[PDB]
Amino acid sequence: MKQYLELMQKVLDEGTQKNDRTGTGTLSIFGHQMRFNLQDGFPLVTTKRCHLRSIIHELLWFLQGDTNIAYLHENNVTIWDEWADENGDLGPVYGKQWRAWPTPDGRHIDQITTVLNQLKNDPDSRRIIVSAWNVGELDKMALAPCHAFFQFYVADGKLSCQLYQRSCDVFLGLPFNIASYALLVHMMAQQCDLEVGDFVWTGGDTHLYSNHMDQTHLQLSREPRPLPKLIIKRKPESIFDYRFEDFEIEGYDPHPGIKAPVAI
Amino acid sequence: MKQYLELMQKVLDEGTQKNDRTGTGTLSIFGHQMRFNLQDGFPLVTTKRCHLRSIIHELLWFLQGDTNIAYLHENNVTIWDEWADENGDLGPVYGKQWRAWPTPDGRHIDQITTVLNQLKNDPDSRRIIVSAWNVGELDKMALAPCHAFFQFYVADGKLSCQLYQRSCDVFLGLPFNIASYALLVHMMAQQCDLEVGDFVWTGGDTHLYSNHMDQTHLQLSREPRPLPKLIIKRKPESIFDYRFEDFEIEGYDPHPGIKAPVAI
Numbered sequence: 001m002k003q004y005l006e007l008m009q010k011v012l013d014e015g016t017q018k019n020d021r022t023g024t025g026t027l028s029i030f031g032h033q034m035r036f037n038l039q040d041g042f043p044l045v046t047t048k049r050c051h052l053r054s055i056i057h058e059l060l061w062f063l064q065g066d067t068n069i070a071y072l073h074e075n076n077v078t079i080w081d082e083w084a085d086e087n088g089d090l091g092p093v094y095g096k097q098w099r100a101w102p103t104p105d106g107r108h109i110d111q112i113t114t115v116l117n118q119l120k121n122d123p124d125s126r127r128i129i130v131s132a133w134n135v136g137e138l139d140k141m142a143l144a145p146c147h148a149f150f151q152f153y154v155a156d157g158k159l160s161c162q163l164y165q166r167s168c169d170v171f172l173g174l175p176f177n178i179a180s181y182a183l184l185v186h187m188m189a190q191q192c193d194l195e196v197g198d199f200v201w202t203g204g205d206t207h208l209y210s211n212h213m214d215q216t217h218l219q220l221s222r223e224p225r226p227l228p229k230l231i232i233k234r235k236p237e238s239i240f241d242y243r244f245e246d247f248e249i250e251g252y253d254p255h256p257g258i259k260a261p262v263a264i
Numbered sequence: 265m266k267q268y269l270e271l272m273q274k275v276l277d278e279g280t281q282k283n284d285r286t287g288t289g290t291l292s293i294f295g296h297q298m299r300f301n302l303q304d305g306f307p308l309v310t311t312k313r314c315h316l317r318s319i320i321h322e323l324l325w326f327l328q329g330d331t332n333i334a335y336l337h338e339n340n341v342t343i344w345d346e347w348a349d350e351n352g353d354l355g356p357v358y359g360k361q362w363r364a365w366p367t368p369d370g371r372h373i374d375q376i377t378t379v380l381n382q383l384k385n386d387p388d389s390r391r392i393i394v395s396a397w398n399v400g401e402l403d404k405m406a407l408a409p410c411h412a413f414f415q416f417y418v419a420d421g422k423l424s425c426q427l428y429q430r431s432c433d434v435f436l437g438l439p440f441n442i443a444s445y446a447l448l449v450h451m452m453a454q455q456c457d458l459e460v461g462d463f464v465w466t467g468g469d470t471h472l473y474s475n476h477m478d479q480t481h482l483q484l485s486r487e488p489r490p491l492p493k494l495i496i497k498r499k500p501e502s503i504f505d506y507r508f509e510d511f512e513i514e515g516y517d518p519h520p521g522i523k524a525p526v527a528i
């Protein structure tokens with residue numbers, strides 16, 4: 001994608017060499033924002049092949065409030081396995097914060113159903129936020145959240161979303177993080193009889209790891225193909241009721257996949 | 265300043281007319297970012313006179329964990345007055361979350377001590393964040409956090425900071441919020457022997473209120489002037505014991521302070 005290839009070119013031309021907790025070394029910039037008008041096409045990378053199945057299953061997993069990896073295993077998703085303890089638990093991560101943020105006095109707030117009730121009764125609110133950054137439970141999480149915070153806004157009967165991502169692995173994580181959030185914006189728009197607006201991505205530490213530089217220069221020498229189409233074949237009774245097979249992706253024809261190591 | 269003024273015209277050319285909680289009406293955009301190189305001077309507006317004594321007093325009030333406007337009265341800062349209960353209290357707002365985010369298990373977390381220790385021991389960290397968006401406590405706050413989430417970054421001996429401001433009053437609040445955080449970046453750079461870097465601002469619902477258009481049109485015809493320079497006259501034993509006496513701006517030659525109606 002134009003926006004994606006241009007962030008890669010910007011971290012290569014402006015990135016400073018940093019060290020990081022996984023030992024691997026990075027090229028790094030701080031502060032970046034880009035926008036995708038979701039009516040132009042579904043924002044899934046065409047310069048290397050990505051796999052929808054995985055983006056969808058992790059999204060369904062977040063929406064049920066799940067933080068154990070067995071659901072993901074049942075549907076062949078492996079990326080969470082190094083962080084999981086012996087019982088497959090990742091601790092209070094995304095799915096838990098989304099659906100059941102713990103308050104000081106006993107309570108639990110479901111941030112997803114709150115947001116659906118704000119878009120319905122009060123779409124002009126400036127407080128239609130979902131946060132995963134629970135400072136209090138961060139010591140209990142397998143990984144502190146990268147895509148930590150997001151805000152929805154409604155305009156001419158169109159739903160927009162902005163995500164604050166504190167840390168971003170440009171080459172490996174970001175194809176999946178933007179497809180994940182753009183999918184949640186078609187799901188919340190369908191539920192609210194709203195049209196799709198913009199998905200705005202903002203990054204804190206936006207980086208390329210040192211052992212991704214050949215890969216990066218190969219992908220960037222590929223010109224983008226036309227952006228694919230998302231078809232939802234079913235409007236479920238609630239947002240928690242989407243199954244994998246409601247979603248069809250049309251017109252997706254990518255360049256060959258490019259592999260690269262995950263820094264631990 | 266040119267970034268701030270470019271944003272102001274953008275909200276007029278492109279802003280959607282929205283109804284808001286006050287009734288006043290607004291012109292609005294979603295998703296906007298601004299980079300301020302702090303080497304080039306202090307980012308306090310020159311097109312209208314801003315009063316540094318109130319900026320510096322609100323911020324020392326935050327850093328001490330205080331949610332009662334008593335301190336701000338001793339030192340004449342008003343603005344938090346319609347939101348305070350008869351005992352002068354705002355609920356667990358900014359300062360309470362910066363210094364004492366409360367767990368489910370009784371304990372508290374001092375996010376400013378955490379963040380100073382991370383800057384003094386692990387500067388490459390992509391988790392040097394402090395959040396004021398405490399979901400389990402939003403209902404006990406008089407007004408939910410506008411400047412909600414920020415992240416620090418260390419690259420070539422320089423300290424940078426990025427802010428997420430969910431809802432923004434371009435005319436009134438935004439001049440004060442840019443100086444306030446740029447100021448914090450200077451106190452943190454000083455306590456941690458780092459040079460100052462970039463201050464990056466990211467907004468959600470960025471808006472201009474209807475009854476501000478005249479003052480905005482007056483401001484857009486005035487040219488910006490050179491930025492001031494912030495001298496910090498001493499080096500305190502901790503970031504918690506700074507004082508009004510310690511801050512000085514050389515080179516501030518603004519246009520007159522412009523009066524404009526606040527919305528309740």
Ligand SMILES: Cc1nc2ccc3ccc(CNc4ccc5c(c4)CN([C@@H](CCC(=O)O)C(=O)O)C5=O)cc3c2c(=O)[nH]1
Nearest residue numbers: 051054055058078079080169172173174176177262263264
């Ligand atoms: C350094 C780093 N660490 C991470 C650790 C946790 C993550 C969890 C999820 C995601 C983003 N979500 C997905 C969700 C599914 C897949 C992938 C990523 C990557 N992908 C693997 C497939 C793994 C496999 O062989 O089965 C791939 O590289 O193609 C997936 O199918 C990124 C990370 C990162 C990440 O991208 N970078």
Ligand SMILES: Cc1nc2ccc3ccc(CNc4ccc5c(c4)CN([C@@H](CCC(=O)O)C(=O)O)C5=O)cc3c2c(=O)[nH]1
Nearest residue numbers: 315318319322342343344433436437438440441526527528
């Ligand atoms: C509509 C609106 N509501 C707010 C809610 C309370 C706020 C609290 C803090 C700040 C930002 N902090 C400061 C810090 C200093 C000053 C002001 C605000 C406003 N101001 C007034 C004086 C104080 C007053 O309005 O009572 C001025 O003359 O410009 C100050 O000197 C803005 C708001 C807004 C805000 O920006 N706009």
Ligand SMILES: O=c1ccn([C@H]2C[C@H](O)[C@@H](COP(=O)(O)O)O2)c(=O)[nH]1
Nearest residue numbers: 021146147167168169173174177390
């Ligand atoms: O959704 C995800 C999850 C993780 N990461 C990356 C960010 C960093 O490269 C790494 C997490 O390491 P820290 O930032 O916590 O150090 O994983 C992503 O890009 N996207």
Ligand SMILES: O=c1ccn([C@H]2C[C@H](O)[C@@H](COP(=O)(O)O)O2)c(=O)[nH]1
Nearest residue numbers: 126285410411431432433437438441
């Ligand atoms: O630091 C601050 C505090 C408040 N506001 C503004 C944001 C909105 O204009 C209004 C708060 O209204 P809500 O967003 O909460 O609805 O005050 C600022 O811009 N900066």
